[PDB]
Symmetry: C5
Subunit: 164 residues, 5 copies
């Protein structure tokens, strides 16, 4: 049923991890849903670029041969894959300011913790790294060693938020 | 005939009841009209998120297994389901100001009264809760005990509005 | 061939006669062109609302049963169907200002004269009601009793406009 | 394959020759490409108007019977078909200012010369009417009687432009 | 499956090399992917122009007979194909300013070097022409004669960028 005719999601070259990962996941998901072969998918790839990136594709066209190589090359030229110590310094710089919802803080911190190499941290030390930066509006009620998984922190945060 | 190819309605994370309920009802209605199966509908769900929420979906992907569970989880993480006393204080705070149409006031107050638990109020006390906040431009003509249902209030409000 | 999948024309609740009549005529025309049945058309109606009006449709869903009833209810809740004397006062308030084209004035005045009940006025008194408000730039050349229909007024107005 | 479902090009009523001619040519071209019959094309015409013009179509609906009559009526009510002496005064009013490209000047002047009645001018006097208003940056090099057609003027203008 | 029905990419007449080359490559790629014949593709070409360029197409319609001739004519009337010495003066005018990423500089300089006639320069002198304008933030670490191809320059530039 077609092969990359037209869609809303495009890519520009904004040089950030979130936009690049969102675009790659959306394209990779669309290919699986619509059911397009691997050889037919690479011919339609300049139908998505609209910016500086199409000038980037006019030069590096002869380096790609398969779909996985082109996707890894798009991940390599733009996502700079920052090292570990900048991430560990970026988590401890900004505390949770007053009058901010729990869910935005938790999803931003989880998206920041996903950048580390996989298999290096469990769930328990993951929650222990995040339990040291919350406001005293939430730390007065729920103590440590009672919340065992990463869902129960939000489950008890939404109760104190409604109570005020 | 396809399975969530592309559409105008998307979701961002605006943290409000009206936008979330509108998006969920529009998606739930589109699934019923187009005739898509339940197993095929969950594979196409990241084609709708475009914001902070796609970073939220990159983390909580392994918690969803059926369509109803994913819809209830999207209702739970964003719509905060406010308690009763804040609603009963929010209805009595703002009176109807001068030079405002009847229909906007009635639809906003009905959308505010839908947040209570279902089966707790009849139609008569529902109209009795709304008849105490209207302007004297409308309360001089129509008295109580004459309007029995919730349609006749608008039916007699549109007559006095045309008369001026 | 589908049933209200996606389209550009939507409705918000702007509270005016022109936008409501345009939206209703466009939807009614699209249903006739595409060839959709009456029972299939009502299931897809919340795919068009995008505003306050979808909160209005979450409350008055159980009042509609057929397509004509829903269309008349949408005409009733928003188009206020103003009385006659306000129209007859609105026609005689604004004269035709200098340096304005004939066609805009004629189409606006015809759209204002359509609001009266049908069958109350002929063509001759219709032109007699409009011939008293034009500029002396056009009334110096063409006199009364020479223009018999409503097309010849524009036909002789476009000649004097080109001449200047 | 459908009959005027939805498209980007619409019409508003901007009262100019270029926008009206572009819209009419695009619609006339789309009808020929998609292959739609003449009786099916007139039912879908209010799906394109979005402005004051739809109020204009609610009044003059009963005057159209064929496609050519409706197209000529749309050309008549909006394009005012200016007389000859205003065109001959409009060509000689604005000279070519300094630092402006040749191609924009030539295409604008050709679009202005198309408004005259057809068959009144050859190619030679057409170029003779345009050779009297160019800058001395171009008239120092190429003389008259050497450029015979209307293409060689641009062909020798692009050479002097690159040279500077 | 259709023949140029509607798409996002259009052309205006912006008079620059990048936008024209992007539009031509996107159209040429779409024709190859969708599988449209050469005779059917030329009838649908005024469905893409939306600007001054459609007035340009109303005049030069009778000069095109095949697809390749129309594409070369669109490349000729707008892309001015600048001479060599302006390019060789444009490369050496702007050095790499401080705090700018390597990839943007490399892709812009490659897109500028593509304008020369093909077959005039190898890869080695191509890298030698670009190695004289970089910042001392990168020239302190990597010396000449160690980087042999044009990929290893970026491969060693991304390492020093992460290190800081």
């Amino acid at each position: 049923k077609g092969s990359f005719s037209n869609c809303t999601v495009r890519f520009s070259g904004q040089r950030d991890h979130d936009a690049v990962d969102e675009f790659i996941n959306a394209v990779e998901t669309y290919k699986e849903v619509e059911g397009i072969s691997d050889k037919d998918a690479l011919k339609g790839l300049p139908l998505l670029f609209k910016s500086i990136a199409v000038v980037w594709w006019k030069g590096v066209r002869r380096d790609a041969k398969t779909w996985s190589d082109a996707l890894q090359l798009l991940r390599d030229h733009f996502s700079p894959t920052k090292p570990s110590y900048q991430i560990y310094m970026e988590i401890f710089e900004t505390k949770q300011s007053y009058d901010e919802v729990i869910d935005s803080f938790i999803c931003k911190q989880r998206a920041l913790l996903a950048k580390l190499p996989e298999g290096r941290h469990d769930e328990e030390t993951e929650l222990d790294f995040i339990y040291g930066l919350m406001q005293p509006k939430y730390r007065e009620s729920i103590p440590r060693h009672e919340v065992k998984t990463f869902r129960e922190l939000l489950d008890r945060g939404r109760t104190v938020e409604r109570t005020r």
